[PDB]
Each structure stands twice: as structure tokens, then as C-alpha cells.
Design a protein around this nucleic acid. Structure first.
Ligand SMILES: [Mg+2]
Ligand SMILES: [Mg+2]
Ligand SMILES: [Mg+2]
Ligand SMILES: [Mg+2]
Ligand SMILES: [Mg+2]
Ligand SMILES: [Mg+2]
Ligand SMILES: [Mg+2]
Ligand SMILES: [Mg+2]
Ligand SMILES: [Mg+2]
Ligand SMILES: [Mg+2]
Ligand SMILES: [Mg+2]
Ligand SMILES: [Mg+2]
Ligand SMILES: [Mg+2]
Ligand SMILES: [Mg+2]
Ligand SMILES: [Mg+2]
Ligand SMILES: [Mg+2]
Ligand SMILES: [Mg+2]
Ligand SMILES: [Mg+2]
Ligand SMILES: [Mg+2]
Ligand SMILES: [Mg+2]
Ligand SMILES: [Mg+2]
Ligand SMILES: [Mg+2]
Ligand SMILES: [Mg+2]
Ligand SMILES: [Mg+2]
Ligand SMILES: [Mg+2]
Ligand SMILES: [Mg+2]
Ligand SMILES: [Mg+2]
Ligand SMILES: [Mg+2]
Ligand SMILES: [Mg+2]
Ligand SMILES: [Mg+2]
Ligand SMILES: [Mg+2]
Ligand SMILES: [Mg+2]
Ligand SMILES: [Mg+2]
Ligand SMILES: [Mg+2]
Ligand SMILES: [Mg+2]
Ligand SMILES: [Mg+2]
Ligand SMILES: [Mg+2]
Ligand SMILES: [Mg+2]
Ligand SMILES: [Mg+2]
Ligand SMILES: [Mg+2]
Ligand SMILES: [Mg+2]
Lengths: 105, 147, 159, 187
RNA sequence: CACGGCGCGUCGCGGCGCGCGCGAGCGAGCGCACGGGGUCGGCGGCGAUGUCGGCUACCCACCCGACCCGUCUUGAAACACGGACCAAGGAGUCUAACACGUGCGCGAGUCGGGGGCUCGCACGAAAGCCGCCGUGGCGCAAUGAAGGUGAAGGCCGGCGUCGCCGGCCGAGGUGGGAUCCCGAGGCCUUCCAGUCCGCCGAGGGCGCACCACCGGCCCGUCUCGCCCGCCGCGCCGG
RNA sequence: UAGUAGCUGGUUCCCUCCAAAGUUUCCCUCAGGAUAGCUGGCGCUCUCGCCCGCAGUUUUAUCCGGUAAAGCGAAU
RNA sequence: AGCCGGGCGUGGAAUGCGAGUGCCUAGUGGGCCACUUUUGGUAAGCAGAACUGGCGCUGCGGGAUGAACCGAACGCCGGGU
RNA sequence: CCCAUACCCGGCCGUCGCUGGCAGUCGGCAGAGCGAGAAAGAGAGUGGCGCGGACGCUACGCCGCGACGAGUAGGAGGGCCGCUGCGGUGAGCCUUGAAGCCUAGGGCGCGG
RNA sequence: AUCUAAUUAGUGACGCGCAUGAAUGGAUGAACGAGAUUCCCACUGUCCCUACCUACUAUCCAGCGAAACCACAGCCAAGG
RNA sequence: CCGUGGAGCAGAAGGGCAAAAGCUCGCUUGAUCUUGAUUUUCAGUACGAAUACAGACCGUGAAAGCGGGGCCUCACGAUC
RNA sequence: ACCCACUAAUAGGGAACGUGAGCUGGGUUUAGACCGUCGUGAGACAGGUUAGUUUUACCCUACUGAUGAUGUGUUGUUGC
């Protein structure tokens, strides 16, 4: 029942929410495991960059962010061809390549 | 902490601060927001007018990004650039005016609220207001639109 | 329970006095009310336009707005445990200047005048209205006639 | 038996700060002594305001301070505020002021020191002026907090411009029945 | 008789009142007490195996008082209900949301909660750091269903019967307002000239926060009416 | 599934201070709620050691009324 | 009618008393009794109202006994009335 | 003439108020006051032997005056009241005897 | 009307039937009924009006041994 | 000729009304468009009803004026 | 309530409308049935009819009886 004055609230606890609860007590262990895997892969690929393949310059696709510049999924075939890089050799020498991206500009 | 709570001081009083005539029963008035129009009508009308009913048009696939348009005011307009910029423009004698781009700092529309210091400015933005335009013109300066 | 009609129980309050029905005398219409006069409320049933509610009958308020035919007045009403100063619009028939204020105004003028006077004389004069003081000592002169006896009369039935 | 009421027998005002830090308590000791051994009431006011809570010591802005000290007659006097002096960015010219406050924002302090004024703390204020002559006692806007827009005469009631408690602002949240003549009634 | 010096005594009405000087407003001791709450600088007995002290607590006697608790109830000792007795257990907790009050840090900003860097690892699953990891949240702008719009102005010189450019000044006004400023006068002693410093104080200022009221500005809507702009002079825009 | 219960029963230490209501309005409302009222807590703005206000009171003025009484040789 | 400026304090009845203001808020929403006024009822320790005070929430002296009557309201004690 | 927890006088506890007082413990480097009907300076200046003196002040402390003290439902404050575990600390205690339990013993606190 | 000394009972008639009635069956009826009623004969302790006798208990003892229930408990009159 | 209302004013009752609020004629559609304020029940919330205004278009009258329904007190309805 | 008979008279009442751990259970008042009226129906009837489990005392007191206690030194007899 409403008290004197306050906000109308709609708590979404009308289901059996107590059976599906995600506690985060394994967060530090997860961070430690991810780190260990990261360094293990970095050691595995001996001289190669730890981050991975280089990626391209892209513009965010929205009025809210079109002023910013991201890191894209991969270089497209038009760019590879005009840069003189074969689409199959780029991946094995360290260039991320995707064929979906176009080039309007 | 349980040490400081009212329950500790309430031990020994049969009632537990809930009365003898009207007990502490489960849900005397109904659960949640029940009876908003029937037996809590007075409270709803007194403290949340306009709760019941419909108004306006429905827009199905709303995308906030289309309507994203942060605003800035003229009193804050000079804070976008460094102080050294403003003082250099102030004691400059060639009449050159510094360029302030609010889109670079993350603003899209310039609204004219505050007083503007008397020195020429080249304000470039995406949207302007009539009063902001007239303030800039009166102080001496230029308004530039960008897309 | 009772009825919530606007004129319930007013058969004597809104009625006209005995042998005083008919045309309203024009002097009531020909009085001037300005902003801020203290004024009395007395509902008159002869005219039904702008009749005040029965709970303001016999109440005294202050004029705050003057209009073509009516006057807006602020008057206090006791509602339960609180008093509200509420403003109502009454047509000019049901209204009458309060004479409780003019006495104080005349007293103000008069004691201000007697304060301005005797200021050069330097004498002392009383302005505050002191309460009725106890009677002072005096002499009661008998003129040679002795006071006559008073005795209770004997009981004897009339009816 | 005595015919009296004990409801308002006990007054509620603060006798000492609810805070537990030691610097404020030392200031309270000093100004307690000053107030009880000096006839000046400036010390009493300052000590009372030291006792007060955070929401009763609202911050004072640089623009407010310069505006209230630019008034005629109060030149070269020390502005005393028991709150926090925060910087105002929508003011370019700042004069030289002699400020005293419990704490000052870093940017505000930089601005005043660059302008040429000096910052004082209530201790040194005691040394400079024990009875506090040449002091302009200021305070921030107490009604500045947004909670005061929800107070007073209840909404949904005629001639009440009181902000309701709504979880989100929009066209679907408290706009239909009590807010329109088209749907029910308009208060 | 809570009268007591000498003067100059009009400081005066006829002397009394009542003023001006008299090393300049300094006589000292002892003592008694109906005097800002009790002292005695007064005494007397009984003390080693039968006596001294021990409020309370152990038992007993007497006088007065005294109905069994808890609970619902207008009303409980009730011919209302629960209770043979004892031990142990036994009931406003935790999460989320919101509101308000309080304490702390920073402050027009604030916050790493997610991730990453730190030789992973007793504590340590902690702690530190990131700053071109502040994405992002809340706040800094509101209003309108929406298209959308989006928060002062006040004075002089240039054509009052100014079109209209400059010179400026700058974010109202009234009332009440804690504090502060000023300050007519006023705060002592041989006199007299004459200061310094500090306190007092008529009136008068500047007026915080806050309240009330009057204006002003922004958005929607209504009424009235005229003017202005052009890349496209229009069912245009202001 | 520890189903719901506006309905019974119970609801665990001490001292100190303050201290009620069974009334208004709405509800398929009448063994219950919401809302005013009554309570407490937290404060804050001033005040005195010329003056401000306030009052379950009186006084002086000034209005308001149709009960007790009375009347039917006055209206009904 | 609103604005400005100026002059008037013997603070213009008695009595008493510091006042104003803002948040958050529990319990309550079965009542009962008495003088007086009063409706229904033959009447009732009945049913229903108005004012004030009580009981409920309250012990104490008295009415032998007693929720309400008369007196008087309460920290632990000594004396007096 | 008798007596209530009423009234008067006195003692003690507590609460509230005076938003009362005290940093002045200013000592042979000193001079012991700010109770006294009257808003304010024991004001500063310039000319005509014996080496001595109690307590205090955990200022969250100490001290002084007045008034007051009923209480269910309920609200608030203080508990050097109590139980269990954790971080500190007591150069803590303890087989020359800890915890627990029993007691016609001695005491403290209004009470826990 | 009969039954009895006496009959709210029973039986036989009367029918204006609060509200009888025809396979929601009406009327009758031999035989039958641990079915429901009234009267008569016989018989009797049902009664007037109680008494006596027998067996097993109850009673006391040896052995063995619970349960219900329990605020505290247990003499009355009146008052409130 | 007398006639203070002893009639009538739609309805219950009460109040009010005489060159009128009654009766008879003439002309009309203020029963129209619009923003606010206030009163009545009241929590001082709605609905309903009502009161003074203000801004346009009108009606009527020679005009002053009066009129945004019925002389007043009742004849009515949220969200979706 | 009425009647028959006797009698001296066949007066009226209370005690939780005395008295169910005293009886009985004929009546009311469960569940089975039948009829009449009512209801579309399940069903209803202060209408009629028929059949329908009546539990416990060993506690306290009261009461009826039975030992005994109490003082006179112990006992006994006779007594008031
Ligand atoms: Mg509640
Ligand atoms: Mg309690
Ligand atoms: Mg409740
Ligand atoms: Mg609850
Ligand atoms: Mg007392
Ligand atoms: Mg209080
Ligand atoms: Mg006795
Ligand atoms: Mg009970
Ligand atoms: Mg009760
Ligand atoms: Mg019983
Ligand atoms: Mg019960
Ligand atoms: Mg029992
Ligand atoms: Mg236990
Ligand atoms: Mg709340
Ligand atoms: Mg449960
Ligand atoms: Mg119920
Ligand atoms: Mg109940
Ligand atoms: Mg009457
Ligand atoms: Mg009469
Ligand atoms: Mg109840
Ligand atoms: Mg009654
Ligand atoms: Mg009381
Ligand atoms: Mg009492
Ligand atoms: Mg008696
Ligand atoms: Mg005594
Ligand atoms: Mg005393
Ligand atoms: Mg108490
Ligand atoms: Mg023992
Ligand atoms: Mg027979
Ligand atoms: Mg027959
Ligand atoms: Mg038939
Ligand atoms: Mg047939
Ligand atoms: Mg049949
Ligand atoms: Mg045996
Ligand atoms: Mg006419
Ligand atoms: Mg008009
Ligand atoms: Mg008409
Ligand atoms: Mg019996
Ligand atoms: Mg039977
Ligand atoms: Mg049956
Ligand atoms: Mg036996």
C-alpha cells in the first residue's frame, strides 16, 4: 500500500528470481585465468605481436559517433588490391582481412 | 550493522512496535500498486496526477542515436578552449579571432544563455539558436555550420 | 444525514424583515467601496444574483477587488482546526460598510490632533483608553429624610 | 500538580558538531572560547554555523562571492564563509579578495591566488580579527538543493508547482489524467 | 534628629534651600555579633573466650497492605481463552528499488563497479596503478503529442514627428532581514594644556541566507496587428 | 509449496525523555485500507538580559441570529 | 491605482507569554461514562446526537466493596498543614 | 481533633532551561580583582633578608543557579548492561589451576 | 356413532378436500413382514411395594501397577 | 367600487416578487465562441452546480442598461 | 387442557424456566425414507409420518457414615 508520498515502483521480482542468480565470486579467478591464457598464447607465438593482426581505420556508423574512429574488423579487398597485397597472403603475414566491407568514399 | 538497528531496542516489547489493536498482518491493503483507482485513489490523485490514461503518438522502433544532440551555452562556450587561447586573442592587436569548434569537444547545438566577453570568436557548430546567433553577432564574430 | 444544498436552513436568515419587502432602497447601490475597506456581509434574499453562501452571513471581511456590480472580499472561515482567509465575490446588495473601523479612525485623528496640540505647551495628556476604574470616595447627602424601611411582602397566591 | 505542558520543553538545536573529525572540533574549541569570552556576536554566529550539518552549509560560488563583495561600502574587507568556496567557470575577471573558508576547491584557490588575493582559514582569521571587524559574512544558497522542488503543497492539487516523484521523464509518465482537461480534469 | 567643619556663601527665595575652594573624592586601628547553610578550643561508659558490629541475604513472629499472569477488549480476578513443572531451541532477517535525514571525499563536475597492467597465489579471492581504458551513468536545460524551438537587459552621441550606427554600463525592483561599516555624542581623580590606544553609543550606511510581492526571459496555446530577409520571392523564413 | 489468508495465537535486556486515536472524505467500503486530524524525531531563522508579535481570557466599539420565553383583542 | 521623496514615536485597552518555519514520521480510524441540552422508545445498565470533563492510558485519600462519583493526579525520603 | 503520593520547608537522583561560568595554572621575569543598581579604560604616555604559594582542565572535562518528573499504543536517546566471532591493543591471566557449575560468605550499581 | 368410569388415542361414517385423485398411477386385496398403530383373553415384580437367595466383583491382604487431568488452589451468606 | 398579494411564477417545500419576477403583445436566439479566477461538498481533490470578471460576435431598447438558459435552493457521470 | 373417582383439600409458585458424569429419550434437532404444498432443477417447509450409538469420577470440595487427632502425668469406669 502507498505511504504518504513517494515514487511508484515496478520491481521485476514476480518470478522465481532466486533460482536464477549469478553471483560473481569467481571474478578474480576468472581474471587470473584469462591473464594466464593471454601470457601463454603470447609465449606460444614467439616474435609475433601479442595483440594479433593489424586492423583498419573505420568511422562509427551513427550520428552520435560518426566523428570518432574505431578499429575495424579487417581490411577489405579493394584496399588490399590497391595496396598490392594478396587476400590469401595477408592473413598469413599478419593482416586481418574481411570481404564484407565496401568502400563508398 | 545489526547493533545500531531498531530491532535490538525493541526486544521485550510484545508488539514489536506494530500495535495491539491493528496487528502486523500480511498484506492489509493488497500487494504492490493494487487499488490505484478504487481504494488508493485519493493518494494516487494527490501525489501522482496524470498516472492513468494515454496521450501522444506511438513511435515503434525508437533509436535515441538519431535524436542525439547535446547542447552547450555561451557562458560555457569559452571554457571549451584553453585560457591561454582566450588571453592571446584578448591582447592580440591584429584583430584575429580564435576558432571554437564545439563538435570537436562533443556538442552539436549552441544555445545562447550567458553573457559573452567582448572579443571576436569564430564559433563553428552543427545547430544554432537565434539568440545565440545574435549574441555572437553583437559581440562581433562569426557563426559557421558544419555537418 | 443532512442535505448538502446551498441554501439549506436559510428560511429565516435570507428572508426579509417584517414590513420591509419590495424595492431595494437605492442608497445601498449608491455607496462607494474602495480597495481595503472593512465591510460586513448580510445576505438579502430580494436579489438572488451574487448571493453569498450562508456560512459568511454576519461575517466581516476586507475588500480587495472592485468590479462593475460586485466586490471581492477576503474573509476568514474556521474549517475544523484551521482558519482560511478565503476571497469571495458578493454583489453589492448583500454588503454594508462596517462601522467598527470608523470609530478607530476618528479616535486616531482626534488623539493625533491632541498630541500635535500641547506639544508646544509641554503638558501631559492621556491617550490610551484605560479600563473603567473603581469608583472613588464621595459623600452621599441625606436631606433630613431618613431612608425608608424595606421588608419582604407576605406570600399570597395569585393564580 | 502544575498546569503546564512538556511538549516543547526541550529545544532541538545542535550543541556540537555531529562530525567526528578532529580539525573541526579544534576549531569548535577555539570559537567556543571566543564566543563565550567576547561580546561580539560574529563569533557566536560563526560557532553556530560550525555546528551545522553539510546540507545546512551549502557551497558558495566564486561568482556569488565577487557579486556580494562588489557592492558599495564593502571594499577591502575579508569575505568569511563557513562552507566550501567552489569555482565558477562562467566568470572571466576575478578581483583580489581576502577569503576565509573551511575548504576551497583547488581550481578556485588557483584562481584567487593568480588574481592576487589570499586565502585564510578560520584559525588565522582568529589571529587576524578575533571579534571579526571588517568581515563580510556570506553563505551559499541554502534552497539550492533539488529536494526542495518536491517539497511544499502536493502536486495534483490546484496552484501547486511541485515536482512529482517519477522514475523517468517522458510522455507516458504522469501526463494523462490529472494534467489535462482532455482526460478527466486539470488541476 | 541617617543634624553636625571652615569658608567663597545669592547656586537664593528671605536665613533655609543649595552651588565653588579647602595636596585637591585616601584616618586608622581593635572588639561584639539575630550578619553570604554547624560547631564544640564539651563529656561518659564497655570491652578475650564471651562479648561488639554485620543494611541486605537464611529461618521465624507480629501490624498494615495485598485477587494470577499473558492476551483480545469500552470493560478481566473473572462463571472469557493459553499455562502441571524444568532444561535447551524459538520469531522484523537478507537482496533490490525509492524517499528523506545524517557522516566523509571531490566539486560543475563526479564515479572504474566492467576490463587491463602489476614476477598470480601464506595473509593475497587482498592492495596498488590505468587517464588517449570516462565507453558509460547521474548532473550541467526546459518545453511540446509531434514536426521542433530552446532561457535579461539598463543609460549618452548619431534624423523625440530617430530610420538606423556607435560610445558605453551591465544580469532587476520594494518590504523585512543575523552579521559588518560609519558615527553625534561618551568612558575620571592635584590641577591645567595636551595626546595616544581601547571600550560605549543617537542616528545613518552596505545589506547574507530566507520569505512575501512586482517586473523580466525560455517552451506550448490563444487574440490583435504591422514589418523585415533571400541562392531558389513561396501554402517560404524571422 | 515455506501455496494465499483484510482472520486467531505469539513476538526475548535496563534506564531516561515525549506521548495519542477510535473523528473527516473516498473505496463491492462496514473485523480492512487510502486521506486529513492527533504523535515523535531532526533541525533551522530570529528574539530579549527601545520593541516585536501571539492568546480556548476579559474590556471598549461595531455588526450577525430567530432558540428559551412570549402572542393569538397580530398574519397562517 | 501604482510609484518615488519628505515629516511625524506618548508603540495609542487590561492581563499573560519568546516566536516563526521546514522535512521525515509511527500508532489510531470497534469506544464508553457523567451534569446540562436533546431524538426514538412504556421503559432499559436500550438505541442516536450537541458542549465540556473524564475512563480508556491512571496510580493515590474518601464513597465498606467498585473502570467513570467527591478530593487530588505520582521521582526516593524527614517535618508541618 | 485525624490523614493523601495534594500544599509549605529541607535533603538526594534525574531531565530541561540559562544555546550560564572556567584556556587566568597571566608567580622574585609575579602581584592573585572583574557580584558590582546605572551602555561603556584598576588606560598609556607629553607640556604649565627568608626563593615561597592546596585542588584543577579524561574541555566528549569540571563547576553554578532555577524550574520540573503519571503513562498504554507509539517515537527517540544513553547503556563502564549482556552473548558469539574478526582487526588492533593489555611485555594481560592460566596445571602454584582456565572454562563451567554450587554457595546460610563480603560488596557495588536505580537497573540491565 | 362405537370402544372406556373417564379417551387430543383407535375404528366406522360425514366431505365445504388450507393443499386427495388416476402408470408423477387411483381403489381393493388372499398369503407374507425382526415394518407402524388400537383393543381383548391368558400371563406375569412393569407397578401397589418391596424382600430374600446364588455366582463374579466391589472390600482387606501378598506380588505387580498405569491413565485422563492439573495457573495457584479448594467451607459458606450477602455486596459490588 | 373595495382589494399588501390572501393569486400566479412547470414540478416538493421554503425564500423572493406589484407601473414586477405575475398577465398580454413586439422583436429576437447571451441556451453562441474563448482563456483564466472564485464559491458550494471538501482532503480544501474531482464531477455536478453556481458566482464575479475579461476578450470577440450579437439580441433588445430612444437610452441608461439588461442578457453568455429557466427568480434562488435539485434535475446528473472518470480512465480505456 | 379436559374428564372419571376419592378426599379435608385435591392452593399457587422458586431453587441456571432445580435436577441427562441421576435415569429415560416419547418431542424437538444430522445423515435413510414417504406424502402434501412450493421450485424448471438441485432442493425448502416453527406441515404431517417412520427408523435413528446418550461417553468418563480413582481428583478437590460438599454430604453420608468409619478410624483417629487435640489437652487433663498414664490408663479405666461412671457421668454433666
Ligand atoms: Mg502505514
Ligand atoms: Mg511501549
Ligand atoms: Mg494496520
Ligand atoms: Mg508489511
Ligand atoms: Mg510534581
Ligand atoms: Mg517533543
Ligand atoms: Mg488486611
Ligand atoms: Mg485472546
Ligand atoms: Mg484499547
Ligand atoms: Mg468456556
Ligand atoms: Mg479465542
Ligand atoms: Mg489448559
Ligand atoms: Mg534459551
Ligand atoms: Mg516515505
Ligand atoms: Mg511464513
Ligand atoms: Mg475483514
Ligand atoms: Mg479482533
Ligand atoms: Mg431554526
Ligand atoms: Mg416555546
Ligand atoms: Mg479495527
Ligand atoms: Mg448510549
Ligand atoms: Mg491523557
Ligand atoms: Mg484519574
Ligand atoms: Mg456504599
Ligand atoms: Mg508527609
Ligand atoms: Mg522543594
Ligand atoms: Mg515519565
Ligand atoms: Mg540456593
Ligand atoms: Mg389406551
Ligand atoms: Mg377415520
Ligand atoms: Mg395433484
Ligand atoms: Mg393420465
Ligand atoms: Mg400425488
Ligand atoms: Mg495388592
Ligand atoms: Mg416591466
Ligand atoms: Mg461580454
Ligand atoms: Mg421566466
Ligand atoms: Mg447435572
Ligand atoms: Mg426418538
Ligand atoms: Mg432425518
Ligand atoms: Mg477402590
Amino acid at each position: 500500500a502507498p505511504s504518504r508520498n513517494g515514487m511508484i515502483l515496478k520491481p521485476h521480482f514476480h518470478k522465481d528470481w532466486q533460482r536464477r542468480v549469478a553471483t560473481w565470486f569467481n571474478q578474480p579467478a576468472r581474471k587470473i585465468r584469462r591473464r594466464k591464457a593471454r601470457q601463454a598464447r603470447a609465449r606460444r607465438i614467439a616474435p609475433r605481436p601479442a595483440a594479433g593482426p593489424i586492423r583498419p581505420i573505420v568511422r562509427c556508423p551513427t550520428v552520435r559517433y560518426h566523428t570518432k574512429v574505431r578499429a575495424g574488423r579487417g581490411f577489405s579487398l579493394e584496399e588490399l588490391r590497391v595496396a598490392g597485397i594478396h587476400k590469401k597472403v595477408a592473413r598469413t603475414i599478419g593482416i586481418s582481412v574481411d570481404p564484407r566491407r565496401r568502400n563508398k568514399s | 550493522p545489526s547493533r545500531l538497528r531498531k530491532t535490538r531496542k525493541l526486544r521485550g516489547h510484545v508488539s514489536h512496535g506494530h500495535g495491539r489493536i491493528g496487528k502486523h498482518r500480511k498484506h492489509p491493503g493488497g500487494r504492490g500498486n493494487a487499488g490505484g483507482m478504487h481504494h488508493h485513489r485519493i493518494n494516487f490523485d494527490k501525489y501522482h496526477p496524470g498516472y492513468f490514461g494515454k496521450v501522444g503518438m506511438r513511435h515503434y522502433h525508437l533509436k535515441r542515436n538519431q535524436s542525439f544532440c547535446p547542447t552547450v551555452n555561451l557562458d560555457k562556450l569559452w571554457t571549451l578552449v584553453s585560457e591561454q587561447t582566450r588571453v592571446n586573442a584578448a591582447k592580440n592587436k591584429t584583430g584575429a579571432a580564435p576558432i571554437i569548434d564545439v563538435v570537436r569537444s562533443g556538442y552539436y547545438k549552441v544555445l545562447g544563455k550567458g553573457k559573452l566577453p567582448k572579443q571576436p570568436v569564430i564559433v563553428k557548430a552543427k545547430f544554432f539558436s537565434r539568440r545565440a546567433e545574435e549574441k555572437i553577432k553583437g559581440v562581433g564574430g562569426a557563426c559557421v555550420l558544419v555537418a | 444525514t443532512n442535505t448538502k444544498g446551498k441554501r439549506r436552513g436559510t428560511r429565516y436568515m435570507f428572508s426579509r424583515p417584517f414590513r420591509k419587502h419590495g424595492v431595494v432602497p437605492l442608497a445601498t447601490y449608491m455607496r462607494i467601496y474602495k480597495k481595503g475597506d472593512i465591510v460586513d456581509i448580510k445576505g438579502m434574499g430580494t436579489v438572488q444574483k451574487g448571493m453569498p453562501h450562508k456560512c459568511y452571513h454576519g461575517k466581516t471581511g476586507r475588500v480587495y477587488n472592485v468590479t462593475q456590480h460586485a466586490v471581492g472580499i477576503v474573509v476568514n472561515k474556521q474549517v475544523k482546526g484551521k482558519i482560511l482567509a478565503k476571497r469571495i465575490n458578493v454583489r453589492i446588495e448583500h454588503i454594508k460598510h462596517s462601522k467598527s473601523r470608523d470609530s478607530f479612525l476618528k479616535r486616531v485623528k482626534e488623539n493625533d490632533q491632541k498630541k500635535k496640540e500641547a506639544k508646544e505647551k509641554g503638558t501631559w495628556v492621556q491617550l490610551k483608553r484605560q479600563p473603567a476604574p473603581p469608583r472613588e470616595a464621595h459623600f452621599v447627602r441625606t436631606n433630613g429624610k431618613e431612608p425608608e424601611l424595606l421588608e419582604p411582602i407576605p406570600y399570597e397566591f395569585m393564580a | 500538580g502544575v498546569d503546564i505542558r512538556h511538549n516543547k520543553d526541550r529545544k532541538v538545536r545542535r550543541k556540537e558538531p555531529k562530525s567526528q573529525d578532529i580539525y573541526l572540533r579544534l576549531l569548535v574549541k577555539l570559537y567556543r572560547f571566543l564566543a563565550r569570552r567576547t561580546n561580539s556576536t560574529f563569533n557566536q554566529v560563526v560557532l553556530k554555523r560550525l555546528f551545522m550539518s553539510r546540507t545546512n552549509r551549502p557551497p558558495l560560488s566564486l561568482s556569488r562571492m565577487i557579486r556580494k563583495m562588489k557592492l558599495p561600502g564593502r571594499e577591502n574587507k575579508t569575505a568569511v564563509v563557513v562552507g566550501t568556496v567552489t569555482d565558477d567557470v562562467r566568470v572571466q575577471e576575478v578581483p583580489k579578495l581576502k577569503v576565509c573558508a573551511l575548504r576551497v576547491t583547488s581550481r578556485a584557490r588557483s584562481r584567487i591566488l593568480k588574481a592576487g588575493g589570499k586565502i585564510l582559514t578560520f584559525d588565522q582569521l582568529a589571529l587576524d580579527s578575533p571579534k571579526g571587524r571588517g568581515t563580510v559574512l556570506l553563505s551559499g544558497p541554502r534552497k539550492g538543493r533539488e529536494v526542495y522542488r518536491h517539497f511544499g503543497k502536493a502536486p495534483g492539487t490546484p496552484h501547486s508547482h511541485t515536482k512529482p516523484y517519477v522514475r523517468s521523464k517522458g510522455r507516458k509518465f504522469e501526463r494523462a489524467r490529472g494534467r489535462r482537461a482532455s482526460r478527466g480534469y486539470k488541476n
